[PDB]
């Protein structure tokens, strides 16, 4: 045996042949709304994304399918070509992410401590997800707090990356947008506020007072303004703080407290990161 | 439930797996010949159009499929990708239109009266067909006497529009060609001769002697030389003569008599309308 | 009935659903390696070509499928779209050519005579293969000793043409490359060495001493430097030496002896023909 996995089985049937669709809205991505649906055999809950059919959508779906095999990428189970209001659309059925957002979960931790080791485990997971994409020459280009979601409500749920609506084949810089995004997420993970305000990005006391240079040097190599200066995903995953995530110190962070204190500005933080990512895309 | 309808199930099998094909010719459209065939389960008679496979054909078929749902558009039941003389072709199976042409049927009415109310019912049907196409941003661009056919030999048969071989997506004027065509059909419906000879388009006595300004104003807004002046299909369907077609006066027309008198020139009338439409397309 | 044959049934499933794949290598073509596999129902041996998925591959496969029906073209049985190392590839399953190369078989004849009539039968077979391709406006563009293979180890096995990795639709010179290739093969068939060295192409004594002008005139019309001077495949197949291949004289050739004597340079002969064909392609 040699370990081929199935190609894109894009289906022509009406989805209602195979899935019961609902009007429960689960989310909105940058291309459109995400709806709940139920598999007509199993009753298992799934999520449906409606994309109006187009060459851009046909490429993006194919990239998400190629991404699907990675344990930290949201899996596609089915894709349909259907007619809706007489205009042709694509319906992507994905696995149900009832676990919510990465940082919203941390902000909802309350009592218990959020450690540098847990930040290392999360950042290893995110980096491991990007590593698969870059190794097959796919760049995500919209890695951000809205797009990192958990599979279940338990503490040991597994984090998966979402919304390939900006993804791009690097075949002949686009890959550097993911590495910048990883540095921003890692910064927010370690103190609860972002490295931007609209005169440097600071490392303010007290939150950073005991934080190592080892992480801060790792941050400095990710947040370079020039894309050519940023470390690659390969170099990131080989850093000891990432590679040896079990051995990382259990250092308590301020992150949860600060995210609660700044909760009224958190929507703005996510919006200006989206604006920064859009600026790096219209490049 | 939400009312999705099935996407283009283009089939790879040999059509003879599914349909018995015959050598009975039913017609010729602008792209090619139309043949009789029989569904191998049901024995129901259908019509087969052979299009040599091409990107232009692949788009046009998709537009005809999107059009198919409208009650006044000829339905596609199946589409096949086959090999013929070693060169790849597309076979479109459509519903059987044994009812013949719109004006040929009127010309064959003989005895009984053809009324302005019946012209309003026909023009409502044609306008209702175009309205669906324009509302999904499809323009037909070849609406003409050859392309409006009836489902059955009875008087109350339903009229359907045919031959998407010039149709075009208006997505970024093409839509105005259908509105010009509707005005020409409406003119011929009301007197039996066209508004062209090769010094105005007339409204000659006696045939127009009792014909209202309400229709003639409606005609004047459709036959404008500049496309930007023509009424839209929306404005046409809202005209009282169209909207209130049951209330339209039962005025007897000269149409059938004139079509019989001018039958020797009717082929030329259809040919010069095709030439006028081709001129408006090479635009 | 009208004799449609099935279109390209390109399949989405994992090939291992349908075929047991092996690590036995059968060959390498210009695009990639050819592997042995077994049909999971029948156990019949087949050959698998892995092409990384691309528009160029999607066209070439379609051309090979259209070619497939000809008895002297290697048949495709199935085509799959699969994922491999997370990158999308195409797997072409072809009929098993255990019979080896055209000239390698002749070189391995040893004892028995190789006749001008047998050279006429081989050249009729090759010309008959090209005739199908040109009649559907496909040019092969890499007809050469590596690409002409036999279906079985018996003397009366049937010769088939292979490797459509350079084939091209002539739709608007490319067709002339096949005719040049046929002339080179015919030359080598008749004496055992090629008409090139890197000052004319000779007809040396003794091998050509009794060879007719009828073949040599046929050769002269195929090896013209200017493509516009070469005979077409139609004119070739109408030549009496080809058309009347059963009536061709049983003249004994030197070919097998010379191929054995020059066996140490035969790999170079095939390589410089490939280089000449590449030069005629980068045109
Ligand atoms: C109880 C419960 C059940 C399901 C969900 C849920 C929410 C959002 C998504 C989802 C599954 C897939 C995708 S995909 C996708 C999503 C989502 N959200 C919008 C953006 C991030 N873009 C995307 O592509 N399942 C939440 N809670
Ligand atoms: C008894 C009997 C049985 C069948 C028919 C019949 C004639 C023409 C067509 C048809 C069905 C589809 C299409 S399509 C199409 C057609 C036709 N005609 C040519 C032009 C208008 N273009 C087209 O695409 N069925 C007439 N009489
Ligand atoms: C016992 C035994 C069993 C099988 C074979 C065998 C060798 C080469 C090929 C083949 C089938 C298809 C194709 S295709 C293709 C091939 C081959 N060879 C490489 C080049 C010519 N290009 C091509 O496309 N079967 C030889 N011996
Ligand atoms: Cl997506
Ligand atoms: Cl059509
Ligand atoms: Cl090939």
Numbering used by the authors:
A (entry chain X), B (entry chain X), C (entry chain X): 45 to 216, 240 to 265, 282 to 366
Paper text:
We performed a three-dimensional grid search over reasonable values of springConstant, angleRange and alpha using the following protocol, with three technical replicates for each combination of parameters. The resulting coordinates were then refined in phenix.refine (six refinement rounds of reciprocal-space xyz and individual B-factor refinement, using the starting coordinates as a reference model). To define ‘incorrect’ residues, we compared each model with our manually rebuilt and refined exemplar using a backbone and side-chain torsion scoring system that we defined for the assessment of CASP13 model predictions (Croll et al., 2019; for backbones the average of unit chord lengths arising from Δφ, Δψ and Δω; for side chains a weighted average of Δχ1 and Δχ2 chord lengths adjusted for the degree to which the side chain is buried). In each case an ‘incorrect’ residue was defined as one with a score higher than 0.15 (approximately equivalent to an average deviation of ±45° from the exemplar). Since R free is only poorly correlated with model quality in low-resolution models, optimization on this parameter alone is inadvisable. Instead, we considered four individual read-outs of model quality: R free (fit to data), MolProbity score (general stereochemical quality) and match to the exemplar at the backbone and side-chain level. There is no apparent correlation between R free and the latter three measures for this data set. The point marked in red indicates the values we chose as default (springConstant = 250, angleRange = 60, alpha = 0.3), representing the lowest (i.e. most conservative) value for each parameter yielding close to optimal results for each read-out.
